[PDB]
C-alpha cells in the first residue's frame, strides 16, 4: 500500500487535504466544556410544605412519593430529604448510559397521578422534577452600589427584566436565581385583629373573594338573537394590583355601621417569597443568577455571548446597579487548551530540532512537521464523529499520545536515510524495502496497541466514563496515524528527501554536525558490542530483571491512590455550622467575620465573598451557611502561598478562633460529583418498623463501634443532623368542641400566623405573582407570643389558645433520611492512612452485621460504583494480554517470539512509578493512561527490535547472536532520536504549577520518568530477551 | 413503548380533573406489561403464628415497593392486602347516639390530622431573636387504640 | 373567559419563560386571545426526534404548570406535535331535512 | 423487558429482603416460567456440544 | 426574494427596538440562500480533489475546473430570459451543470 503510495503522489496529498479539512470543518464547530459526562443521570423531585416540620412534611408528603415510584426503568437507588424547613428533596440515580429526558419524564409521569393524594398546600406550592447538573457554567451576582435596594428589590428586578433574557441567549441550560421576584405581602397584627373580633381565616376569605377574576359572559353573544349588530367581551372583576389596592381590602361592618379594612389590621409591604436565605456579597445586599450549560452548547461561546447580554441591559439599570462575577468556568477552559494546543506547538519544534541535530537538513525536519500536525487535525474528526468534545479530559488525550505519534513519524524518515547511506540508493526508490522491513511492524503496532488502550473503555461506572474518553481519543489519534504513515509519509520521503550517497553520514564536516556523527558513531560501537559482552553470560541480567519485575511490584502497591488531582480553580468556599437551634441573624454574624478575615488578612487574593446565609452545604437552616470566595487571577497570585491549599490553611487554621460555629474553608475538585478518592458512602436502614429512636441508637452502636478502630477507618460521621428540641402545642378536642371552637379554625389561624400561607395571586406590573398572609414578625417569636392570638367560637365570642390547648418541648429530628423507600441514616468516613477504600468497606460492613436486629446496611454513591464496577483491571487486561501475544505471534508467525516482546512491560512500569513515589504523587488516572503510552512506546520499539533480528536471520540467515548486534545497531538511532523528543516536550508540564498544574502534573511526571528506564534501559534488555526467547525451543 | 405510555398519559391527564375526586384518591395508573404471569413469589408462615390477613401485610408494606420499583417490572398484582385502620361501624349504635356515618367521617378527619405550625423565631425575625424551634400540632394517630 | 391580557400575562408567560434549555429548539410563537385560550408552538431543527422533542417539551412543562391559575390547571393543558394544515376535509350534509 | 434478566433481579432484591423477616415467615416458589427457558436453553448447547 | 428584500428595507427604516424577523415558510427561504455559497463552494473544492486523486495532476483538475463557468452561464441565461428564478431546484440544477 505504502508502496501503491510511494508511486501514486498526489492520492496521498488529497487524502491529507480532507483530513485536516475534516478535522478543520469539526474544530471550528465542535462542543467545549470543562469536563464532558461523567455521572449517571440522576432525577430530582423537590417541594415545600410551607411551615411543615420533618415529620409533617415526611408522612404527608415524602413517603407517599416514594410508595409511588413504581414501572420507572432504570432505577438503581433512591434516596430522600425530609426537613423541618417543609422542604423536601426525593433523588433518583439511574443506570449509566439511560437517556435523562426519558428517565425524568417517566417520573415526571408517576408523581402527576400520586398529585390527588399530597396535601392541597403542596399542591398549591407545585411539586417539581428536574435533572441533577450541577456544573454551573457562570454565576451573575447582582449588587446595588447606593445601597437602596434590599436583597428582595434586586432579586425582583433579576427575576423581572434579566431572568428570561438570559433564559433565552443560545447555549445556557438552565437558569436559577438568587431571590424570588415580589409577592404581596399582609403581615397580621393578632391584635388588631381580637378588636374586630376577627381570624386570620377572615383576613384569608376575603383575599379569596376580593383578588379572584372572574367569568363574565360577553354581549351579542352566540346564539346570537336575529339580527345583531354589536358583539363585545365582558369585563368582570380581575386582580388588584397595588399595596394600596390590597389595604383597600373591606374585612367587616361592625354594629355602628362602621368600616375595617385590611390595612387596619395588619402591614402591606411588598417582600419576598421565601425570608430564609440572606445572600450579600462582599457584605452588600445581592441577588442573581447561577446559569448552566446547555446539553451540547460551547463554554467559551454561551459565556461570551451571555456577557454580550448583560452588557446590554447595562445602561437602562436603575441608579446604580453592579453586575459582579464571581464564578465562570471559562477562564480556567481557555487556559487549559492555550497551555495544550502549546504543548502541541512546543512538541513539533522540539522534533524539528532533535531531527535537524541527528540527521541534518532542512527537508528529513519538515517530513514530520507537516504529517502529525495532519493526524491531530484529524482526530478532531474522528473524535466528533462518535460525539465526543473538547474538554479538560479529550484534549489530556492526544497530547499524552503525542509520544506515539511522533515514535510513528520518525522511524519511517529514519528508516529511509538508514538505507540511503548503507546502500546508497536514490530517492524515490529507497523508501520501498525501507517499508518493506517495517510495513507489518507498524500494522502489528496497530493491532498491539489497539489491546493495550481499547480496553479501558470498558471499566464500568462513572470513573468508566473519564477512561473512555482517553481510550477513545488515544486509539483514534494512534489508528489514524499508523494510516498517515502507511500512506502519506512513504509518500513524503520519496519526495522532499535528497539522495545521500553509500557512506555520506557527515563523519567529517565543517561544524558541530560533523563531532556529532563523529562521536555517535564512537558511541554507537561503544555501545553495540556492550550488549555483545552481556551475551555470553547472560544469567547475571536475569537477575536485574526479576528484581525489577519485583522493583515495580515492591513499588505500585506502595502507592497511593486517587482520581483526579484538584486545580487552584480561581474560587473556593468555606462552611459555617452554628449549633442546634442558633438563628439566622447569630448565623450572619459569623459570616461576616468570615467576610472579614478574607477581605483583610487576604486581600491581594480574594477578589470578592458570596455568601449565602440559611442554605448551608448540609442543608437548609437558620443555623447555617456558605461563603463563595472568587480570588484575583492567577497572574496576581504567585507561589504556593498565593495558590489555594495555602489560602485555605490560613483560614482553616485561621477559623478556630470562632469559640461558636464549627466553620472550615475547603477546595472543591475537579469533577465535582468525584467524592474523596478515599471515601465510603454507608446507609442505615431501618428494616422492620423500628423507628426513629431505635434507628438512632444503633447507628450510634456502630458509629462508636465504629471510631474505635482508628487503625482502619478514620472520621466515621453521620451525614445528617442530631435531633432537637421542638415546642408541641397539643389541643385539648373535647375542650374546644364545648366552646364552640373548630379544629379547622384554630389551625389556620395557628398555622397562618406561624407558618405563613400563600392565598392566591395577583398581578405586580403584568406580571402574576404570589399573595402570602403571614403574623408580624413580633407577634410570632417565642412560646408566651401564642397569648396574643384568638381564634373566634360559633357564638361570636374571641378565645385564646390557654381556653383549648397546652404547650410541651420535646426531641425533633429536624431532617430524616430515607434509602430506597425505607428509613435510613447516612454514614460516611474513610480508609485510615494506609488503607484501602475496599477494605474500610469491608470492615464497616462487619461492624454492622452486629446490630439490633432489624437494622441493615447498603452502600451508596462513590462506594456503590465502586462496589459494582471497580474491581476489574486483572479480569480485563488478561484478555488484552492474551489478544497482544495473538497479535505478536501473527506478526512473527512464532507460538514464542512474542515473549520478547511482551517482558519488555515492567521496564516502563518502573521508572513511571519510580518518579511518582520519589515525586509524591497518586497511582490515578493521569498517572493511569501514561503507564499506557509508556507501555506503548517501549512496546513498539522493541516491535521494530524484535522484528529486525527475526529477519537477518529468515531473510540472510544472519547471527542469531549477531543478527541482534546488527538489529539493535540499526534501531539505536530512532530509539534515541524519539525518547529525548518526548522527554524534552514533557518537561514543560512536569514543572508547571498554576492554572492547571496538577492536571499538568500528573500525566507528564509519571510518563517521563518511565521514559527514562523505559529507554535508557530496553537498549541493553530487548536483545538480552530476544536472544534468551530464541535459544528456548 | 416508553412514548407510548407518554402519550396515553397526556391525554389522561386532559381527563383526570374529570374523574370523580374518590376516583383520583385511589390513584389511576398507566402502566406498561405483558399480560402474563413471568412469575408469582409465594409467601408461607411455617409457625402458624401468622394470619392470611398478617402476611398480606407484611409483604405489602415490606416488599411489595421494592419489587414494583425494580426495573422490567413492568405491573406487580398482589395476592391480598396491605392492612388499613378499619371503622367497621354499627348502625344501631350510631341511632342510639344519634349520629350517621357523616359524623364519624368528619370526627375522623378533625382527629386524625397532621399539621404544619410553622416556628419560633420564624424568619423573617425581630432584630436580635435567639432562640428558633419548630412548632408541632396534631400528627397522624397510629394505633387502633387512639381511633 | 379572561381577557388576552389577563391571560397572556398569568397562563402565556409562565409556560413561554419555562421553554428554555430545549435542543434543537429553532423557534417559538405563542399567541393568546380574548376567549381565554393560549396555543404555544414549538418548532425544532430538521431532524430532531419529534418524540423525544415532545418529551423535553413536557418536561419543561411540568416546571410552569403549578404556576398557572387554577382554572387553566383544570381545563387540562396539552403537549403535542402539531402541524398547521389539513390533510383534507370530509364534510357531512343530509338530503331531505330530516 | 428481558424477562431472565428481570427474574434475576427479583430473585437478588429478594435475598436482601431475607435475613429480617419476622420468624417462621419463607418465600416459597409456586410458579415460574424462567427455569424452564433457561433449561430449555441448556438441552440445547448439550446437543450442539 | 425580491418582495422579502423590499421588506427588509421599510423594516430598518421603523422606530428603535422595533426590529424584526422571518418564520414559516420566509424562514426556510432565507436558509436556502445564506447556504447556496458554501453549498457550490465545497462542491467545487471535492471535484477538484476527486480529480487530483484521479489523473495523479494538480493541472489536468485545475484545468477541468476551468470549464464549470461556461457550462452555468447557459444554465443561467435558460433561465434568466425564461422568466424563471434561483430557487432550490436551480441551485441543484447548478450542481448538476458543474
Ligand atoms: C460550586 C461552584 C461552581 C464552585 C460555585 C462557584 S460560585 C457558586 N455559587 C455562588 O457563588 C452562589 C451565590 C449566591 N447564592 C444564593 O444566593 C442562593 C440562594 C438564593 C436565594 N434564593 N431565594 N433567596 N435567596 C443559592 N442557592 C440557595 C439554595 C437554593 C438554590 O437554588 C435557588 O436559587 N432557588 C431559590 C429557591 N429556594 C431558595 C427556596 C431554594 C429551593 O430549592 O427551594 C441555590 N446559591 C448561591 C450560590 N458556586
Given at each position: 500500500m505504502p508502496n501503491f503510495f510511494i508511486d501514486r503522489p498526489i492520492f496521498a496529498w488529497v487524502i491529507a487535504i480532507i483530513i485536516m479539512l475534516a478535522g478543520g470543518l469539526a474544530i471550528l464547530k465542535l462542543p467545549v466544556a470543562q469536563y464532558p459526562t461523567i455521572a449517571p443521570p440522576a432525577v430530582t423531585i423537590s417541594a415545600s410544605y410551607?411551615?411543615?416540620?420533618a415529620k409533617t412534611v415526611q408522612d404527608t408528603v415524602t413517603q407517599v412519593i416514594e410508595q409511588n415510584?413504581?414501572?420507572?426503568?432504570?432505577?438503581m437507588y433512591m434516596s430522600s430529604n425530609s426537613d423541618s424547613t417543609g422542604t423536601v428533596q426525593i433523588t433518583l440515580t439511574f443506570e449509566s448510559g439511560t437517556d435523562a429526558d426519558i428517565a425524568q419524564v417517566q417520573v415526571q409521569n408517576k408523581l402527576q397521578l400520586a398529585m390527588?393524594?399530597?396535601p392541597q398546600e403542596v399542591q398549591q406550592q407545585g411539586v417539581s422534577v428536574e435533572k441533577s447538573?450541577?456544573?454551573?457554567?457562570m454565576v451573575v451576582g447582582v449588587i446595588n452600589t447606593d445601597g437602596t435596594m434590599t436583597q428582595e428589590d434586586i432579586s425582583d428586578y433579576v427575576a423581572a427584566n434579566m431572568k428570561d433574557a438570559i433564559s433565552r441567549?443560545?447555549?445556557?441550560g438552565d437558569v436559577q436565581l438568587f431571590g424570588s421576584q415580589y409577592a404581596m405581602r399582609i403581615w397580621m397584627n393578632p391584635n388588631e385583629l381580637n378588636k374586630f373580633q376577627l381570624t386570620p381565616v377572615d383576613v384569608i376569605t376575603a383575599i379569596k373573594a376580593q383578588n379572584a377574576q372572574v367569568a363574565a359572559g360577553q354581549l351579542?353573544?352566540?346564539?346570537?338573537?336575529?339580527?345583531?349588530?354589536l358583539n363585545a367581551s365582558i369585563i368582570a372583576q380581575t386582580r388588584l394590583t397595588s399595596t394600596e389596592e390590597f389595604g383597600k381590602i373591606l374585612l367587616k361592618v361592625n354594629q355602628d355601621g362602621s368600616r375595617v379594612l385590611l390595612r387596619d389590621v395588619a402591614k402591606i409591604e411588598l417582600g419576598g417569597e421565601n425570608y430564609d436565605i440572606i445572600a450579600e456579597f462582599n457584605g452588600q445586599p445581592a441577588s442573581g443568577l447561577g446559569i448552566k450549560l446547555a446539553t451540547g452548547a460551547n463554554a467559551l461561546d454561551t459565556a461570551a455571548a451571555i456577557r454580550a447580554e448583560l452588557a446590554k441591559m447595562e445602561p437602562f439599570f436603575?441608579?446604580?446597579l453592579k453586575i459582579v462575577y464571581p464564578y465562570d468556568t471559562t477562564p480556567f477552559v481557555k487556559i487549559s487548551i492555550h497551555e495544550v494546543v502549546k504543548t502541541l506547538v512546543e512538541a513539533i519544534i522540539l522534533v524539528f530540532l532533535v531531527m535537524y541535530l541527528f540527521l541534518q537538513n532542512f527537508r528529513a525536519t519538515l517530513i514530520p512537521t507537516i504529517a502529525v500536525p495532519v493526524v491531530l487535525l484529524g482526530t478532531f474528526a474522528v473524535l466528533a464523529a462518535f460525539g465526543f468534545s473538547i474538554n479538560t479530559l479529550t484534549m489530556f488525550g492526544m497530547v499524552l499520545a503525542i509520544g506515539l505519534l511522533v515514535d510513528d513519524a520518525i522511524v519511517v524518515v529514519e528508516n529511509v536515510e538508514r538505507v540511503m547511506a548503507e546502500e546508497g540508493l536514490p530517492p524515490k526508490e529507497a523508501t520501498r524495502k525501507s517499508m518493506g522491513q517495517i510495513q507489518g511492524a507498524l500494522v502489528g503496532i496497530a493491532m498491539v496497541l489497539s489491546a493495550v488502550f481499547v480496553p479501558?473503555?470498558?471499566?464500568?461506572?462513572?470513573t468508566g466514563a473519564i477512561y473512555r474518553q482517553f481510550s477513545i481519543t488515544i486509539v483514534s489519534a494512534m489508528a489514524l496515524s499508523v494510516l498517515v504513515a502507511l500512506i502519506l509519509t512513504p509518500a513524503l520521503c520519496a519526495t522532499m528527501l535528497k539522495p545521500i550517497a553509500?557512506?555520506?553520514?557527515?563523519?567529517?564536516?565543517?561544524?558541530?554536525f560533523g563531532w556529532f556523527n563523529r562521536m555517535f558513531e564512537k558511541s554507537t560501537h561503544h555501545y553495540t558490542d556492550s550488549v555483545g559482552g552481556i551475551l555470553r553470560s547472560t544469567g547475571r541480567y536475569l537477575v536485574l530483571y526479576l528484581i525489577i519485575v519485583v522493583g515495580m511490584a515492591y513499588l505500585f502497591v506502595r502507592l497511593p491512590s486517587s482520581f483526579l488531582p484538584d486545580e487552584d480553580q480561581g474560587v473556593f468556599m468555606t462552611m459555617v455550622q452554628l449549633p442546634a437551634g442558633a438563628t439566622q441573624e447569630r448565623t450572619q454574624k459569623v459570616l461576616n467575620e468570615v467576610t472579614h478575615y478574607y477581605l483583610t488578612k487576604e486581600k491581594n487574593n480574594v477578589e470578592s465573598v458570596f455568601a449565602v446565609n440559611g442554605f448551608g452545604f448540609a442543608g437548609r437552616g437558620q443555623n447555617t451557611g456558605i461563603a463563595f470566595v472568587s480570588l484575583k487571577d492567577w497572574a496576581d497570585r504567585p507561589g504556593e502561598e498565593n495558590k489555594v491549599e495555602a489560602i485555605t490553611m490560613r483560614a482553616t487554621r485561621?477559623?478556630?478562633?470562632?469559640?461558636d460555629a464549627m466553620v472550615f474553608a475547603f477546595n472543591l475538585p475537579?469533577?465535582?460529583?468525584?467524592?474523596?478518592?478515599?471515601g465510603f458512602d454507608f446507609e442505615l436502614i431501618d428494616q422492620a418498623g423500628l423507628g426513629h429512636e431505635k434507628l438512632t441508637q444503633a447507628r450510634n452502636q456502630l458509629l462508636a463501634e465504629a471510631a474505635k478502630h482508628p487503625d482502619m477507618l478514620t472520621?466515621?460521621?453521620?451525614?445528617g443532623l442530631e435531633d432537637t428540641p421542638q415546642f408541641k402545642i397539643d389541643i385539648d378536642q373535647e375542650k374546644a368542641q364545648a366552646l364552640g371552637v373548630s379544629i379547622n379554625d384554630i389551625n389556620t389561624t395557628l398555622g397562618a400566623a406561624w407558618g405563613g400561607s400563600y392565598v392566591n395571586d395577583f398581578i405586580d406590573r403584568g406580571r402574576v405573582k404570589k399573595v402570602y398572609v403571614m403574623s408580624e414578625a413580633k407577634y410570632r417569636?417565642?412560646?408566651?407570643?401564642?397569648?396574643d392570638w384568638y381564634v373566634r367560637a360559633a357564638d361570636g365570642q374571641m378565645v385564646p389558645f390557654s381556653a383549648f390547648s397546652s404547650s410541651r418541648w420535646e426531641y425533633g429530628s429536624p431532617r430524616l433520611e430515607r434509602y430506597n423507600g425505607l428509613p435510613s441514616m447516612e454514614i460516611l468516613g474513610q480508609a485510615a492512612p494506609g488503607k484501602s477504600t475496599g477494605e474500610a468497606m469491608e470492615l464497616m460492613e462487619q461492624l454492622a452485621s452486629?446490630?439490633?436486629?432489624?437494622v441493615g446496611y447498603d452502600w451508596t454513591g462513590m462506594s456503590y460504583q465502586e462496589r459494582l464496577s471497580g474491581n476489574q483491571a486483572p479480569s480485563l487486561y488478561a484478555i488484552s494480554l492474551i489478544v497482544v501475544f495473538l497479535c505478536l505471534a501473527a506478526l512473527?508467525?512464532?507460538?514464542?517470539?512474542?515473549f520478547s516482546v511482551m517482558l519488555v512491560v515492567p521496564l516502563g512500569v518502573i521508572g513511571a512509578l519510580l518518579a511518582a513515589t520519589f515525586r509524591g504523587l497518586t497511582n490515578d488516572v493521569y498517572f493511569q493512561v501514561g503507564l499506557l503510552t509508556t507501555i506503548g512506546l517501549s512496546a513498539k520499539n522493541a516491535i521494530l527490535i524484535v522484528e529486525f533480528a527475526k529477519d537477518l536471520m529468515?531473510?540472510?540467515?544472519?547471527?542469531?547472536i549477531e543478527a541482534t548486534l546488527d538489529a539493535v545497531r540499526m534501531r539505536l538511532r530512532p530509539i534515541l532520536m524519539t525518547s529525548l523528543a518526548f522527554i524534552l516536550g514533557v518537561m514543560p508540564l512536569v514543572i508547571s504549577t498554576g492554572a492547571g498544574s496538577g492536571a499538568q502534573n500528573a500525566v507528564g511526571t509519571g510518563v517521563m520518568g518511565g521514559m527514562v528506564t523505559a529507554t535508557v534501559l530496553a537498549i541493553f534488555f530487548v536483545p538480552v530477551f530476544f536472544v534468551v526467547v530464541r535459544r528456548r525451543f
Amino acid at each position: 500500500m505504502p508502496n501503491f503510495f510511494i508511486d501514486r503522489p498526489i492520492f496521498a496529498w488529497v487524502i491529507a487535504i480532507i483530513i485536516m479539512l475534516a478535522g478543520g470543518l469539526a474544530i471550528l464547530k465542535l462542543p467545549v466544556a470543562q469536563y464532558p459526562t461523567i455521572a449517571p443521570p440522576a432525577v430530582t423531585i423537590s417541594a415545600s410544605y410551607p411551615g411543615a416540620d420533618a415529620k409533617t412534611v415526611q408522612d404527608t408528603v415524602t413517603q407517599v412519593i416514594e410508595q409511588n415510584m413504581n414501572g420507572i426503568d432504570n432505577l438503581m437507588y433512591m434516596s430522600s430529604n425530609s426537613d423541618s424547613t417543609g422542604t423536601v428533596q426525593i433523588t433518583l440515580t439511574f443506570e449509566s448510559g439511560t437517556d435523562a429526558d426519558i428517565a425524568q419524564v417517566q417520573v415526571q409521569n408517576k408523581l402527576q397521578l400520586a398529585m390527588p393524594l399530597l396535601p392541597q398546600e403542596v399542591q398549591q406550592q407545585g411539586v417539581s422534577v428536574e435533572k441533577s447538573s450541577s456544573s454551573f457554567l457562570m454565576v451573575v451576582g447582582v449588587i446595588n452600589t447606593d445601597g437602596t435596594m434590599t436583597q428582595e428589590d434586586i432579586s425582583d428586578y433579576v427575576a423581572a427584566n434579566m431572568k428570561d433574557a438570559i433564559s433565552r441567549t443560545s447555549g445556557v441550560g438552565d437558569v436559577q436565581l438568587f431571590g424570588s421576584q415580589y409577592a404581596m405581602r399582609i403581615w397580621m397584627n393578632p391584635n388588631e385583629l381580637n378588636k374586630f373580633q376577627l381570624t386570620p381565616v377572615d383576613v384569608i376569605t376575603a383575599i379569596k373573594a376580593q383578588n379572584a377574576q372572574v367569568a363574565a359572559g360577553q354581549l351579542g353573544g352566540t346564539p346570537p338573537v336575529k339580527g345583531q349588530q354589536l358583539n363585545a367581551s365582558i369585563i368582570a372583576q380581575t386582580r388588584l394590583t397595588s399595596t394600596e389596592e390590597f389595604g383597600k381590602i373591606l374585612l367587616k361592618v361592625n354594629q355602628d355601621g362602621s368600616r375595617v379594612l385590611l390595612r387596619d389590621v395588619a402591614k402591606i409591604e411588598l417582600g419576598g417569597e421565601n425570608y430564609d436565605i440572606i445572600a450579600e456579597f462582599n457584605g452588600q445586599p445581592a441577588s442573581g443568577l447561577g446559569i448552566k450549560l446547555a446539553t451540547g452548547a460551547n463554554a467559551l461561546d454561551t459565556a461570551a455571548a451571555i456577557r454580550a447580554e448583560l452588557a446590554k441591559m447595562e445602561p437602562f439599570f436603575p441608579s446604580g446597579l453592579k453586575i459582579v462575577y464571581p464564578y465562570d468556568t471559562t477562564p480556567f477552559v481557555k487556559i487549559s487548551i492555550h497551555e495544550v494546543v502549546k504543548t502541541l506547538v512546543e512538541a513539533i519544534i522540539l522534533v524539528f530540532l532533535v531531527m535537524y541535530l541527528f540527521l541534518q537538513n532542512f527537508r528529513a525536519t519538515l517530513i514530520p512537521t507537516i504529517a502529525v500536525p495532519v493526524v491531530l487535525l484529524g482526530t478532531f474528526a474522528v473524535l466528533a464523529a462518535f460525539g465526543f468534545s473538547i474538554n479538560t479530559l479529550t484534549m489530556f488525550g492526544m497530547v499524552l499520545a503525542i509520544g506515539l505519534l511522533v515514535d510513528d513519524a520518525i522511524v519511517v524518515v529514519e528508516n529511509v536515510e538508514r538505507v540511503m547511506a548503507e546502500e546508497g540508493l536514490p530517492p524515490k526508490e529507497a523508501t520501498r524495502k525501507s517499508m518493506g522491513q517495517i510495513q507489518g511492524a507498524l500494522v502489528g503496532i496497530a493491532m498491539v496497541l489497539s489491546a493495550v488502550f481499547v480496553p479501558m473503555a470498558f471499566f464500568g461506572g462513572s470513573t468508566g466514563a473519564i477512561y473512555r474518553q482517553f481510550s477513545i481519543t488515544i486509539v483514534s489519534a494512534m489508528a489514524l496515524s499508523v494510516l498517515v504513515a502507511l500512506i502519506l509519509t512513504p509518500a513524503l520521503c520519496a519526495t522532499m528527501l535528497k539522495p545521500i550517497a553509500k557512506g555520506d553520514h557527515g563523519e567529517g564536516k565543517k561544524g558541530f554536525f560533523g563531532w556529532f556523527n563523529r562521536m555517535f558513531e564512537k558511541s554507537t560501537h561503544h555501545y553495540t558490542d556492550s550488549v555483545g559482552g552481556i551475551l555470553r553470560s547472560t544469567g547475571r541480567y536475569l537477575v536485574l530483571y526479576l528484581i525489577i519485575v519485583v522493583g515495580m511490584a515492591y513499588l505500585f502497591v506502595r502507592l497511593p491512590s486517587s482520581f483526579l488531582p484538584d486545580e487552584d480553580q480561581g474560587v473556593f468556599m468555606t462552611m459555617v455550622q452554628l449549633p442546634a437551634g442558633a438563628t439566622q441573624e447569630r448565623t450572619q454574624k459569623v459570616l461576616n467575620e468570615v467576610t472579614h478575615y478574607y477581605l483583610t488578612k487576604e486581600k491581594n487574593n480574594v477578589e470578592s465573598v458570596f455568601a449565602v446565609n440559611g442554605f448551608g452545604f448540609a442543608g437548609r437552616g437558620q443555623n447555617t451557611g456558605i461563603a463563595f470566595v472568587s480570588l484575583k487571577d492567577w497572574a496576581d497570585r504567585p507561589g504556593e502561598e498565593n495558590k489555594v491549599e495555602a489560602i485555605t490553611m490560613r483560614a482553616t487554621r485561621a477559623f478556630s478562633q470562632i469559640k461558636d460555629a464549627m466553620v472550615f474553608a475547603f477546595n472543591l475538585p475537579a469533577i465535582v460529583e468525584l467524592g474523596t478518592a478515599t471515601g465510603f458512602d454507608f446507609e442505615l436502614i431501618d428494616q422492620a418498623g423500628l423507628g426513629h429512636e431505635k434507628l438512632t441508637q444503633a447507628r450510634n452502636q456502630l458509629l462508636a463501634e465504629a471510631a474505635k478502630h482508628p487503625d482502619m477507618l478514620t472520621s466515621v460521621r453521620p451525614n445528617g443532623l442530631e435531633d432537637t428540641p421542638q415546642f408541641k402545642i397539643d389541643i385539648d378536642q373535647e375542650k374546644a368542641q364545648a366552646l364552640g371552637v373548630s379544629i379547622n379554625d384554630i389551625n389556620t389561624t395557628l398555622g397562618a400566623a406561624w407558618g405563613g400561607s400563600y392565598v392566591n395571586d395577583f398581578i405586580d406590573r403584568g406580571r402574576v405573582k404570589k399573595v402570602y398572609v403571614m403574623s408580624e414578625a413580633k407577634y410570632r417569636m417565642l412560646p408566651d407570643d401564642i397569648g396574643d392570638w384568638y381564634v373566634r367560637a360559633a357564638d361570636g365570642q374571641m378565645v385564646p389558645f390557654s381556653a383549648f390547648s397546652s404547650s410541651r418541648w420535646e426531641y425533633g429530628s429536624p431532617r430524616l433520611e430515607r434509602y430506597n423507600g425505607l428509613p435510613s441514616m447516612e454514614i460516611l468516613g474513610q480508609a485510615a492512612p494506609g488503607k484501602s477504600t475496599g477494605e474500610a468497606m469491608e470492615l464497616m460492613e462487619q461492624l454492622a452485621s452486629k446490630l439490633p436486629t432489624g437494622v441493615g446496611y447498603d452502600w451508596t454513591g462513590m462506594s456503590y460504583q465502586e462496589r459494582l464496577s471497580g474491581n476489574q483491571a486483572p479480569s480485563l487486561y488478561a484478555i488484552s494480554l492474551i489478544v497482544v501475544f495473538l497479535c505478536l505471534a501473527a506478526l512473527y508467525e512464532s507460538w514464542s517470539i512474542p515473549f520478547s516482546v511482551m517482558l519488555v512491560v515492567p521496564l516502563g512500569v518502573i521508572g513511571a512509578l519510580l518518579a511518582a513515589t520519589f515525586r509524591g504523587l497518586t497511582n490515578d488516572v493521569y498517572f493511569q493512561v501514561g503507564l499506557l503510552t509508556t507501555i506503548g512506546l517501549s512496546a513498539k520499539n522493541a516491535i521494530l527490535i524484535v522484528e529486525f533480528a527475526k529477519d537477518l536471520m529468515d531473510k540472510e540467515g544472519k547471527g542469531l547472536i549477531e543478527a541482534t548486534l546488527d538489529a539493535v545497531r540499526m534501531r539505536l538511532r530512532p530509539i534515541l532520536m524519539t525518547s529525548l523528543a518526548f522527554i524534552l516536550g514533557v518537561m514543560p508540564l512536569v514543572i508547571s504549577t498554576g492554572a492547571g498544574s496538577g492536571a499538568q502534573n500528573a500525566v507528564g511526571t509519571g510518563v517521563m520518568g518511565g521514559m527514562v528506564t523505559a529507554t535508557v534501559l530496553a537498549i541493553f534488555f530487548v536483545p538480552v530477551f530476544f536472544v534468551v526467547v530464541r535459544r528456548r525451543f
